[PDB]
């Protein structure tokens, strides 16, 4: 990780090297601005003392010093600007370069490698790592150098003025620098700590919010809520301990600063009264050294930031440097000229590097001539798609050599070969760009005449003619705006615009109807005479007119020949053909009212922290006055001991007050956040499912709302109260004391108070390193990088690195132009505010010398007004900067309230309704129509009806996506239909009890989902509000034939299973799903794909418990395997939501319809 320091600046032109050198010099000069100011001030105090003791010369001398101050002001102005701007510019440019190259390197990558890392994590990683690198490079280095200069100038000034007092302060300086470092780190990392604390809970929250429909089906919302509560208690305890520690450390830092003031002034009075040092000289030395030793503390955030940058840089430069075995762009690739269609495969062995232990392929040998339509038939699992992906050189075979027209692929260019193989994969997805652009994505220079010819070959011009913006329609994300058939037809067109030499279709007519598939195949035979073609499909209507048909078995191509050859061969294909023939209010505190004690105490301490600034002035002023006036030694010694004691006491009570304020308001924030997270989670579990359907509410938005809004409400309330209190104390007292002691000077400084406050705020934002607005805005340009990799379809269809690499660069170009304007504007804003501080220092003290001159007010008074007003304003600024934005937090509280008071349609807690004591078990659907609330225009149902009696094994067979699980969601009270009538034993479900119907029945999900707990508990999951006996646990485990795999495992019924059963296999987690449904003992039982991933000996041992228990309970099984369908009672076939055939299985086998084509598919 921490290697190649000089390499992080590798992407740096000459201009950026210049910018960095000039910026660091401006930094060092800025650093030598505070110390010299303290020297000038220490001499001005000597002048005020002497002249007062006498003073008509006062004014004149002060004129001189005013010039000096103004001088330094201007200097620290220019340096400041040149520093900040220049460093920002350097970082800016480098970041841009890194960004633009990184995405490029990300775009080209072996597909095997792509399999190893997740898409989501990588995408996040790009942006987050680049922002971290920039945070380092930008300003942390310049601020480090400024601090280094401020520290060394401080110590040298302190050693030249007077060396003894600066020795003493060096002695207590380590403790001071360490305090500064700790304090800076805390302020910077306070927001980060919370994200680390909450993670353990956040995981469980994310799991259960992900699998909402499942957990709702199992009634186990309460138990899950319990787990979440436990993780919340842990998070609350961590956050409270961290609050105690942060505040004890800040309290101790303040106590140490005040004790340093007390020590320095005690020793300074011993010196001054001894005659060695003047009072202004003690001030010079002490302040130069104190400020020089605080500067060291600021360096740590900068050094820590640089280490982080180095870390992320290593992992990004690995991906850049990483050279894949197969590159997408090759200049050395040999390109052929007389490209004639010829395919040669010999001894081809290859395995996926994602799972290299399993070998799917054990050698395939093929020779395909030109114009030869070759079809390959075989069950899903032999790897037709594997051969398709092997063709385009998405990988390389581990054994043998493949060749295209004589010479092998291993010495010829990859891009030239990839452009001349038109491939359509299994699933098409329409891009977001306009359809003209999508069809243009084939090749660069295509005119609209070729476009119209290609779309008329694709026969996809009717739905282009019906919809507006016939070449300007922006299709939505992932082809959601249009239908699937139009999608696949335009995908065929998108392939055909390349004018290829070898055409490869992979399941090109999955969801297509009859006539469109027919005209598409006619168009395919229209353009097959000059090219070689390979077609993979499930429908045999487009296969029978091919050249050669072949057959996969265990990855090996077994049967070869024409149609009649495989007819007389009587193989598996002969079996196949024989079988075939908004609103926000101030009610965000009314919820935390119950915690009013913590606030009262917390307000009190609050005032005291604000009040400390005036006290420290009144003593500071007075302490300097002990050497202005003309008293004897003993009076000076006694009054100086008294005020030094007051410095110590102010420190001790500052410690106590900061600790108590922090601890109280922090426990208020913690308790508010706990209660909000718990209540919001509870109301989310109670919420309906359709609410989770809405696209505005998504699986992630809910997790993000939980972890941000619940956390920001505490800011919105507590921080607001504590900030207004601290500030009103600290500024009201200051302006009143200053109004009393001298009003002429107080008006002059009140005229400037705004700018000083704004300058404190700006410096606080610099230290806090608040995230850069520009990238936050630029987020709009990231969706390109997200989509262009997420799809991974046209990217495979065409290398597309140029088109999408350039669209990304182009979208990036706009925020870059704004980033430099931002760097200049912010440099100027920083420089002006600091220079204003120095000029204020000059103008206040000059006017004060004119006042002292005309005996209008003393010197103690001008000093007290200066401190209590000017630095009171600066403290107002800093504390108002720490406060979180009130508008963000107020809107957020309104959002949380919207969720909390949200009313669910289907109540889950109420018991009202129809509660009969008995039932029979008959279900009757009549004219039921259902439309999805997210898809109001697309009707999936058109008035179904069904009659189910006791113990009637009702099979539901149909296409993938014809309303198979819809009848389940209509039974389980997920979606109530708009029309139709459902009678449950002559009892309408809409009038019954809601939890009784969810209590009675029990189902197995379409995909098995497992909570993060032990398998014995996980398999048991399914029954609640009941004492769960372990004899029923082991009985269910024997009945589902999972008892073996449980008794085999160590800690057999305590074995911790991860998220969604990712540790154990799919057949086992499907079997334990069966054992989960089994403990319910339902009188109505539903099965949805009971044998999706299961062995043939395990299907029988699953079905034997079913057949023995199918008596007494109504059973409804929905699957694609015909094994459970042959033995069913009545069978219902669907077609676009319409019941086509119903009755017994022998009646459907007599009258040959579509169920005859369904049943007879692979039998014989």
């Amino acid at each position, epitope marked *: 990780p921490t290697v190649s320091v000089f390499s992080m600046f590798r992407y740096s032109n000459w201009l950026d090297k210049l910018y960095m050198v000039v910026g660091t010099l401006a930094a060092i000069i800025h650093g030598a601005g505070l110390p010299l100011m303290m020297l000038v001030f220490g001499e001005m105090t000597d002048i005020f003392a002497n002249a*007062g003791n006498l003073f008509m010369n006062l004014e004149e001398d002060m004129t001189r010093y005013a010039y000096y101050y103004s001088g330094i002001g201007a200097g620290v102005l220019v340096a400041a600007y040149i520093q900040v701007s220049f460093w920002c510019l350097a970082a800016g440019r480098q970041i841009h370069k890194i960004r633009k190259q990184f995405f490029h390197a990300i775009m080209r990558q072996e597909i095997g490698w792509f399999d190893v890392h997740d898409v989501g994590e990588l995408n996040t990683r790009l942006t987050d790592d680049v922002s971290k690198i920039n945070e380092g490079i930008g300003d942390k280095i310049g601020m480090f150098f400024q601090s280094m200069a401020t520290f060394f100038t401080g110590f040298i000034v302190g050693f030249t003025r007077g060396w003894k007092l600066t020795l003493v302060i060096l002695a207590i300086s380590p403790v001071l620098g360490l305090s500064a470092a700790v304090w800076a780190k805390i302020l910077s990392s306070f927001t980060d700590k919370e994200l680390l604390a909450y993670a353990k809970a956040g995981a469980v929250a994310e799991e259960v919010l992900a699998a909402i429909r499942t957990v709702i089906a199992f009634g186990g919302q309460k138990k899950e809520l319990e787990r979440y509560n436990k993780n919340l208690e842990e998070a609350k305890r961590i956050g409270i301990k961290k609050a105690i520690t942060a505040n004890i450390s800040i309290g101790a830092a303040f106590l140490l600063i005040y004790a340093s003031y007390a020590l320095a002034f005690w020793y300074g009075t011993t010196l001054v009264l001894s005659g060695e040092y003047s009072i202004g000289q003690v001030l010079t030395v002490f302040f130069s050294v104190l400020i020089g030793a605080f500067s060291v503390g600021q360096a740590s955030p900068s050094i820590e930031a640089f280490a982080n940058a180095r870390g992320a840089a290593y992992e990004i430069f690995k991906i850049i440097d990483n050279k894949p075995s197969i590159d997408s762009y090759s200049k050395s690739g040999h390109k052929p000229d007389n490209i004639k269609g010829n395919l040669e495969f010999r001894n081809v062995h290859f395995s996926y590097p994602s799972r290299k232990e399993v070998k799917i392929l054990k050698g395939l040998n093929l020779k395909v001539q030109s114009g030869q339509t070759v079809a390959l038939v075989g069950n899903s699992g032999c790897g037709k798609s594997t051969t398709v992906q092997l063709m385009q050189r998405l990988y390389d075979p581990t054994e043998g050599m493949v060749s295209v027209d004589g010479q092998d692929i291993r010495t010829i260019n990859v891009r030239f070969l990839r452009e001349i193989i038109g491939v359509v994969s299994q699933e098409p997805v329409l891009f977001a760009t306009t359809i003209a652009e999508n069809i243009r994505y084939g090749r660069e220079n295509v005119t609209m005449d070729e476009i119209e010819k290609a779309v008329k070959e694709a026969n996809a011009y009717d739905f282009i003619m019906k919809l507006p913006h016939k070449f300007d329609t922006l299709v939505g994300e992932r082809g959601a705006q249009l239908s699937g058939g139009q999608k696949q037809r335009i995908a065929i067109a998108r392939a055909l615009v390349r004018n290829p030499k070898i055409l490869l279709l992979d399941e090109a007519t999955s969801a297509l109807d009859t006539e469109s598939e027919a005209v598409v195949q006619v168009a395919l035979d229209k353009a097959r005479k000059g090219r070689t073609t390979i077609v993979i499909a499930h429908r045999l209507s487009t296969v029978r007119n091919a050249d050669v048909i072949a057959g996969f078995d265990d990855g090996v191509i077994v049967e070869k020949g024409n149609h009649d050859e495989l007819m007389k061969e009587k193989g598996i294909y002969f079996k196949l053909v024989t079988m075939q023939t908004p609103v926000s209010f101030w009610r965000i505190m009314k919820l935390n009212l119950t915690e009013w004690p913590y606030f009262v105490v917390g307000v009190f301490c609050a005032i005291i922290n604000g009040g400390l600034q005036p006290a420290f002035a009144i003593i500071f002023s007075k302490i300097i006055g002990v050497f202005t006036r003309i008293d004897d*030694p*003993e*009076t000076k010694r006694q009054n100086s001991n008294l005020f030094s004691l007051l410095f110590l006491a102010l420190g001790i009570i500052s410690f106590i007050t900061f600790f108590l304020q922090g601890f109280t308001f922090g426990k208020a924030g913690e308790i508010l956040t706990k209660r909000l997270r718990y209540m919001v989670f509870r109301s989310m579990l109670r919420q309906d499912v359709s609410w989770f359907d809405d696209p505005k509410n998504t699986t992630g938005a809910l997790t993000t709302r939980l972890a941000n809004d619940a956390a920001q409400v505490k800011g919105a309330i507590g921080s607001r109260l504590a900030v207004i209190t601290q500030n009103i104390a600290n500024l009201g007292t200051g302006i009143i004391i200053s109004f009393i002691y001298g009003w002429q000077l107080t008006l002059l400084l009140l005229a400037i108070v705004p700018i000083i406050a704004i300058a404190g705020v700006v410096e606080m934002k610099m230290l806090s390193g608040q995230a850069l607005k520009d990238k936050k805005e630029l987020e709009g340009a990231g969706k390109i990088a997200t989509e262009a990799i997420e799809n991974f379809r046209t990217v495979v269809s065409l290398t597309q690195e140029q088109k999408f690499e350039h669209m990304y660069a182009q979208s990036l170009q706009v925020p870059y132009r704004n980033s430099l304007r931002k760097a200049h504007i912010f440099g100027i804003t920083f420089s002006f505010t600091q220079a204003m501080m120095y000029f204020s220092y000059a103008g206040c003290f000059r006017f004060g010398a004119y006042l002292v001159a005309h005996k209008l007010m003393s010197f103690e008074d001008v000093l007290l007004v200066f401190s209590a007003v000017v630095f009171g304003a600066m403290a107002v600024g800093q504390v108002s900067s720490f406060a979180p934005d009130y508008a963000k937090a107020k809107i957020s509280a309104a959002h949380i309230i919207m969720i909390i008071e949200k009313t669910p349609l289907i109540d889950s807690y109420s018991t009202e309704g129809l509660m009969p004591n008995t039932l029979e078990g008959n279900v009757t659907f009549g004219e039921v129509v259902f439309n999805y609330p997210t898809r109001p225009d697309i009707p999936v149902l058109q008035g179904l009806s069904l009659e189910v009696k006791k113990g009637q094994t009702l099979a539901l067979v149909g296409s993938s996506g014809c309303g198979k699980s819809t009848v389940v969601q209509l039974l389980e009270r997920f979606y109530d239909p708009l029309a139709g009538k459902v009678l449950l034993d002559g009892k309408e479900i809409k009038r019954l009890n809601v939890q009784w119907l969810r209590a009675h029945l029990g189902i197995v999900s379409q995909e098995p989902i497992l909570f993060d707990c032990s398998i014995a508990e996980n398999i048991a999951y399914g029954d609640n509000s009941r004492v769960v006996s372990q004899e029923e646990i082991v009985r269910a485990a024997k009945e589902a034939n999972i008892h073996a795999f449980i008794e085999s495992l160590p800690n057999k019924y305590s074995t911790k299973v991860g998220d969604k059963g990712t540790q154990l296999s799919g057949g086992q987690k499907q079997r334990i799903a069966i054992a989960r449904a089994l403990v319910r003992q339902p009188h109505i039982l539903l099965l949805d794909e009971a044998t999706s991933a299961l062995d043939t000996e395990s299907e029988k041992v699953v079905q034997e418990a079913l057949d023995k228990a199918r008596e007494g309970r109504t059973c409804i099984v929905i699957a694609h395997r015909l094994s459970t369908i042959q033995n069913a009672d009545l069978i219902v076939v669907f077609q676009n939501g319409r019941v086509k055939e119903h009755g017994t299985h022998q009646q459907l086998l007599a009258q040959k319809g579509i169920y005859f084509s369904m049943v007879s598919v692979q039998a014989g």
Partner: antibody
Amino acid sequence: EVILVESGGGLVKPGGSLKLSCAASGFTFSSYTMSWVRQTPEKRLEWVATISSGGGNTYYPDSVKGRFTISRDNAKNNLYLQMSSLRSEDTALYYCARYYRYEAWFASWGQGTLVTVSA
Amino acid sequence: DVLMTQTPVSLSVSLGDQASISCRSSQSIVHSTGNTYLEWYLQKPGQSPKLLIYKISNRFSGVPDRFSGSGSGTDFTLKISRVEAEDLGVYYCFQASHAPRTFGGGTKLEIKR
């Protein structure tokens, strides 16, 4: 220059109380320590009080302590010594005094007032 | 309590010459900070005493440079030179080092004629 002018005193009977006030003008009185010195008819000198500038530090030699109070009113630049319980031995001439920077206790003496304590 | 004693009480001197007064201080008068804080005073017949030296070496601003002073630890002296009839009166020593403060006994001068 500095004009210091004492007034008060005169004749008093033992156990008595008097108030000596010394008006001070010319030298921004609110910033100078002020002392009170005494001289007896034997021609000796002694110290009788000091008070810091506009402040609360008061010093006294053992004899006068508890019986003599010293105060200053800056509003008009006045210095008041209030004596009580006057023993028969405090017959004397009382001079105000000012404090010189560079630490030289009695710099400018006002004019003495005469206090006589005898039955 | 510190007791200050001036050796010569009646120091008669010829007009035009140099006369010296000596004041001996017990306890080696030394403030904590390190300054002796011993001062001399002159009182003319029928006038209020005035300051001569605010320190053993330092001379108050307005005093002829013929008045000199010298002092070490627990002993101090004052050398008037070129006696002039305006330098006739009484000479007192004051010490502010110790927490009480005490004038020494007066010494009288006389212009021999």
